[PDB]
């Protein structure tokens, strides 16, 4: 007497290609899929422009010192983050 | 077999120790009396020194940090009249006989069954036969590799189960997938250097870890 | 590249050439001992509340040191590998990244796969939501510069 | 999610295991019948072969 | 400084994660900072207008 | 129990214990411990192990009753390249073992080994009414021998070998003695190498098995012999 639905699986790449084709193409270039002759796809490689990372540990876990080296790293990340937000805002501010 | 030997408290038996049993489950909660019984295998009293020493201290006295894996047996179970048994007359020193091998050999096979999750002996025998055919020069290391390649033990290494027994139940419930889908022959196969394991019961496993470490989590965020 | 601050240089292959005899009349290789090591075991921990002992087996324990560092790299280092690969795949090959961070090629490729999966979750909106939203960073590959510790002491310069 | 990388080079267990004593006992119960079947199948890994479907007695 | 222990001049204690939750506590901290900025604009407008 | 004191004792430096233990052992008289002082000093450079070989009981009858006498043999050796056999006689089994164990340290001898794990070549020895054979094996292959020889190999440090013993093996003292003598009949590549005028170089050559083993396993020998 289980209410849990049956689980039929599929490879991660298989699901991604149907949900977001752009991400799938980017992953192939990063994961070095164009170096081996046997596994080389026919489609030409796509250039990588933007990536996303998580900086929670680098900001609040990893750099506790008061030296200029640790302060500079945190400030640069904060400054870059604000620039990204401002670019998004400018795209919407105009009437 | 609703025996006491199939419970964690009495799972492992060793006849060469002062207390015959041995504790191998890192998450078992013992009572005060039980802890006292097990502690007798850790502390020993030296007559000439008039002090208590521990097993770790004994290794330091022998200058043992990294030793050949076959030499650790002589340190755990034997005694020396110049380091740890100084002051005892030679007449009362214990020396083993060639007739004690069978008890030791049977005990070690029982350990392999316990680590794998209370497996049957025929299961271990076939595992040994499998390694005889695989490539490699050191027989001892091939056995070790086979144990690691087992799926249920690998799930335990990930850190999502308290012990191997809990990991086995998770496989029967299909809480972990192999290469994107539930595994086939999950109890009999070996994992390869490029296999990918993922949790499908994400909500269940997250609750398990949070509850375990709730008391050791700081009260300041 | 000094042994004091380079564990990798300490853990390097050894060229063994040992002889017994007289080089002017007759010599023979010294085969009276094994200088290549063997499998070792060590006791690592002892829990005093449950009386549990932990033993660690190492294939090459006698010819390596501090092998535990490889699998415990900081999150900052992993993100750096991910960004370098995206910035210039032509120069930052798997071989180059492995040599730079003193790890194996298999580890380099495995790290990239996990970081790529996490990035998709962040973009899709499954992680870093609510109060932790500000910590999801989108980085353009062009706007990235790697500093070096060229000046002796504290201080990182752009070139 | 986890990924395996290569054959292990280190391992830790919450007890001491004597592998030589374990294998010495297990070397007493080995079956030549089971080993021979495993040897034959190692040479017939490829299904798409003519020589994998000859006439023989038993399973292999 | 008279407020030696209350270095940050807080009016209410921080929420306990073990009782209210980690996510709730983090959101409360963000709301507190915005309130301080809003209160600053509040006083200036009232003073300028009246 | 005080857990804090238990933890303190567990994680402590043992230098003070080592000094006290060494001084006590080296200051004991030669009656209780008849080991020479020179041997005692070396006992702190290695790790030692011991095992009982056999215990025999002899009976002598008289007018009224019988006199029982015990004899024992004990083997001891440091893990790598040291082994010795001792014999002791006493009126009780416990005393006979103790005397034999002490006598073993006075009979320590060196055991030649190739790379410290096997023998240089095939050895066949004939101790009186006993025959022992030793066959070298590749590193990591393991030990194939009886239980008694398995214990003896552990003491000396032998890791890969095949041993076969036949003949009148009722007396285990002879069996152990025959094994000890066989190990001392090996020859090394560096014996009198100065008189050869050549360079004796170690080479890598895989050993072969007989034709029957290949046929049964369905495998092939090295291509250097199959060339046709
Ligand atoms: K069983
Ligand atoms: Mg025979």
Q: What report would you give on this structure?
A:
- The structure is cut from a larger assembly and holds chains A (95 residues), B (221 residues), C (159 residues), D (60 residues), E (50 residues) and F (228 residues).
- With 95 residues, chain A is mainly alpha-helical.
- Chain A is 48% helix and 5% strand.
- Chain A has helices at residues 12-19, 21-30, 56-60, 68-90; one strand at 50-54.
- Chain A is extended and about 50 Å long.
- Chain C is α+β, with helices and mostly antiparallel strands.
- Chain C is 28% helix and 18% strand.
- In chain C, the strands form 2 sheets. Chain C has a two-stranded antiparallel sheet. In chain C, strands 3-4 form a two-stranded antiparallel ribbon.
- In chain C, a hairpin with a 4-residue loop joins strand 3 and strand 4.
- Chain D is α+β, with helices and mostly antiparallel strands and 60 residues long.
- In chain D, 32% of the residues lie in helices and 10% in strands.
- Chain D has 2 helices and 2 strands.
- The termini of chain D are far apart.
- The relative contact order of chain D is 0.08.
- Chain E is mostly helical.
- Chain E is built from 2 helices and no strands.
- Chain E has helices at residues 17-20, 22-49.
- The termini of chain E are far apart.
- The interface between A and C is medium-sized, with 30 and 38 residues.
- Magnesium ion (MG) binds at residues 164, 166 of chain F.
- The PDB classes it as ribosome.
- Keywords: mitoribosome, ribosome, mitochondria, polytomella, fragmentation, rrna, evolution.
- Structure of the mitochondrial ribosome from Polytomella magna with tRNA bound to the P site.
- Chain A is mS110.
- Organism of A: Polytomella magna.
- Chain B is uS4m.
Short description:
Chain A is mainly alpha-helical and 95 residues long. Helix content of chain A is 48%, strand content 5%.
List the helices and strands and how they pair.
The structure is cut from a larger assembly and holds chains A (95 residues), B (221 residues), C (159 residues), D (60 residues), E (50 residues) and F (228 residues).
Chain A: H1 12-19, H2 21-30, E1 50-54, H3 56-60, H4 68-90
Chain B: E1 12-13, E2 21-22, H1 32-39, E3 43-46, E4 51-54, H2 55-61, E5 67-68, H3 72-77, H4 101-116, H5 121-133, H6 139-149, H7 151-158, H8 164-172, E6 176-178, E7 196-199, H9 202-212
Antiparallel strand pairs in B: 1-2, 3-4, 6-7
Helix pairs in contact in B: 5-6, 7-8
Chain C: H1 7-10, E1 19-22, E2 26-29, E3 40-47, E4 52-58, H2 75-87, H3 94-101, H4 105-124, E5 136-140
Antiparallel strand pairs in C: 1-2, 3-4
The structure holds potassium ion and magnesium ion.
